[PDB]
Design a protein around this nucleic acid. Sequence first.
RNA 1: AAAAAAAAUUUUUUUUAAAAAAAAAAAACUAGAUACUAACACAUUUAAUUUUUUUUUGUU
Length: 139
Amino acid sequence: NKHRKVEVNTIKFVGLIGKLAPTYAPPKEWMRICFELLELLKSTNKEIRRSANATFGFIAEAIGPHDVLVALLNNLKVQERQLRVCTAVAIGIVAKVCGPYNVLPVIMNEYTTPETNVQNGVLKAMSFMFEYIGNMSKD
RNA sequence: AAAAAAAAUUUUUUUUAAAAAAAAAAAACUAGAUACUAACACAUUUAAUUUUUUUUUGUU
């Protein structure tokens, strides 16, 4: 819907269902949302971009991490900086919620790609995921 | 008494050569070309409180 009051108040409502009732919409519906959010964090506002990243955790918990990551890592190729940083946060959030062992070999593989913007976005994603799993990190 | 199958030692010349023990670009000036970095900032902001300034001049 563009605008903002709608984007913010919706993202908080969608993420609510990800917490409370994940099992209702079928997982192909959660994937329809993960694309609509991944386009939505172009937004100029912050609280939008922040809530959009939090609801990848709620979806990754619901359906699965690997369906979601491939959606995100395909988005690091993109030029514009917010999109690469706000995907790099989400990979950090998908790591914490679903476990880093699920995320990490997929990210270490993606680092091989010869484009530079992926290679920072894979290093920035690893920064975030090491502050969100605080103590773990040792393994 | 006279007519048939197996064997060993010591001395001498050379032709199509090689090897490089490992550091380089500059700098300055002036303009142009293109990538990128900071969860950078980007719509809410406004219900106690200091820009509010004048030769004092508002009466039982």
